[PDB]
Design a protein around this nucleic acid. Structure first.
Length: 108
RNA sequence: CUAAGAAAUUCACGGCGGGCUUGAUGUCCGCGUCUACCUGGUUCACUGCCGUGUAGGCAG
């Protein structure tokens, strides 16, 4: 999203910490609204916003700058495959690599 | 029907200042190298003559 949206994403990630409010932003009414200090209708509208932000909310489409390669079928036509950059996977491999390269274990 | 398909890096520049590397030294004892072979495989594509001839042959 936009970087101003990433500010609200950091706020939501900070709200997830400490209590069980990361899974309890949606699944709670009294403990959520009493801490939020809003009306019950406003609390329901706020819970719907977090439920929508957790969901995808994207129409299925690709772009012209993406890859969309052809794979051949066994004795048949072809299929289009649009490969997506795995971001969580490289973040995990990057965490493992920066752990292996530097730590008190690695430096020791 | 290829993580497909596309692309201008680039302009300019002072690295130089100077210097003692020295003294000293035991390489050394000992040793069985042997046995057996066809340089020819056409291996010297030569030398001279008749013929104007490079054309063609001759003689050793």
């Amino acid at each position: 999203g936009n970087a101003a949206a990433l500010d609200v994403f950091k706020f939501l990630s900070l709200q997830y910490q400490g209590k069980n409010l990361l899974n309890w932003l949606t699944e709670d009414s009294a403990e959520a609204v009493q801490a939020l200090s809003d009306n019950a209708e406003q609390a329901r509208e706020w819970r719907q916003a977090f439920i929508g932000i957790t969901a995808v909310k994207g129409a299925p489409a690709s772009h012209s700058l993406a890859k969309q390669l052809y794979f051949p079928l066994p004795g048949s036509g072809y299929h289009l495959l649009a490969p997506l950059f795995p971001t969580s996977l490289v973040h995990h491999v990057h965490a493992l690599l920066r752990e292996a390269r530097f730590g008190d274990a690695a430096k020791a």
